[PDB]
Design a protein around this ligand. Sequence first.
Ligand SMILES: [Mg+2]
Ligand SMILES: [Mg+2]
Ligand SMILES: [Mg+2]
Ligand SMILES: [Mg+2]
Lengths: 262, 261
Amino acid sequence: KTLQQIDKLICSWLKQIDNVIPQLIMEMTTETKRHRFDLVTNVDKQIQQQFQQFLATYFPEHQLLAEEKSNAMITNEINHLWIMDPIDGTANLVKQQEDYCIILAYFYEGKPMLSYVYDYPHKKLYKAIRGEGAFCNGIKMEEPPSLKLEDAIISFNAQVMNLDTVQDLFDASFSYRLVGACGLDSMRVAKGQFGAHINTNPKPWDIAAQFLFAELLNLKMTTLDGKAIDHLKGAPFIISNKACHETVLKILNANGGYQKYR
Amino acid sequence: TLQQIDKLICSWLKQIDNVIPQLIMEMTTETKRHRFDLVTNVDKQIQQQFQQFLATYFPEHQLLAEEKSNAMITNEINHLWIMDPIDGTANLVKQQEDYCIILAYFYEGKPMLSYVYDYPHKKLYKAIRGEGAFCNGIKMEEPPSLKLEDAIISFNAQVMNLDTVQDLFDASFSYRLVGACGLDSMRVAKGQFGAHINTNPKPWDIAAQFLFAELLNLKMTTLDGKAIDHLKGAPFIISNKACHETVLKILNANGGYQKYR
Ligand SMILES: [Mg+2]
Ligand SMILES: [Mg+2]
Ligand SMILES: [Mg+2]
Ligand SMILES: [Mg+2]
């Protein structure tokens, strides 16, 4: 199989989920996990099951690393690895029915080859294909214009950060917005609408697709130390326009750094 | 009937839909009071064109609007339209997304028609005294009750004290921000958010919301619980009914929400 061929299969499968999701929204059940605000719905689980049955049924060699199942499951060493957040932004799904997505990323011998962020509520499928480029619904994306921090909007979670560094990021930037799903706030950076998105504790599925978007669109995607991220393991991370990446990291690691307690 | 006036407004909106591309094509950006206070040709032309519409079809009606001078009398005026030609100009210029047109009509002080048009996503929220509130025709209903602890909230955390920001985070389900008063308010009308706060809105930022709040059974007041005068700003909130008091309580507590540094 060629990559365009695999993409044809995956797009096709993502598109056919437009048919299923409404039914699941209509019969939505909710459980908690690590605490009462750590939600998981019937929608998350059904989308994951169906992808795994789809993977089993076309790429039986390939593995799945995904949020709503256990994963061991090794480096890398796994020739063909899929990583999935069946619903990124479950809270938003639950509370708003909007601003959530589906994340998939394909890795061959550890190198990222295909990435998808599907903004279902707005029927906007973002994908990235190595050798072809990045697209939103077939409309090819290009590297965004340079944005300095003071000219850019930033997105991050202000509840899990020391309020001093929160303030500094407000002061240093043009404005603050939050969509509330890593894949969506990440896409706003890829489109050039936000200068940078931060998440101080993502799981691997929250950021798996963004790797290839960052590469093909000359974005910086690093740890909050400016280091490479290991796609199997999470790390605190940033996805940024090139002209403001250094400035945001400088601000975050300043004065003892960015955690509550420093 | 306002049904009639509504058809005409809707038809003006359709016409503006065909116009905005051209305006973007030749977009031009200036700043007003500071580097963060933007205006573009899109703002100016949309406004000028409603002014023309109104001079054509309703010559006794008056217009209070962001991009022009306004005097223009408090009380004592029978047909008044309030306009924010683009609400979320920062979003337009920075994101080309999440901005709206805000338009509302007031007959002897009373809300009769209101319009929040989310052009980017082709969604028109309207409200019509006697008929109801609509989103592209689908009738909007009063949203379910939302206690604060089960609700997402939206506000500008930069303009506020960081102790009351925290206390607001502590008491709600989560925090989001769209960045246009029109759209953050419509999230509340839809029950996606429990409340939205703006501490220093202009009349045009909040003018459409009065009529939505009334018909959908929301609360809309100052940050002291009072009636808002539609002709002048005031620090304001629009809230699901089941979280209004709690939010106001938290905002006024420990000496208030205002910056101290
Ligand atoms: Mg989760
Ligand atoms: Mg998830
Ligand atoms: Mg303005
Ligand atoms: Mg405006």
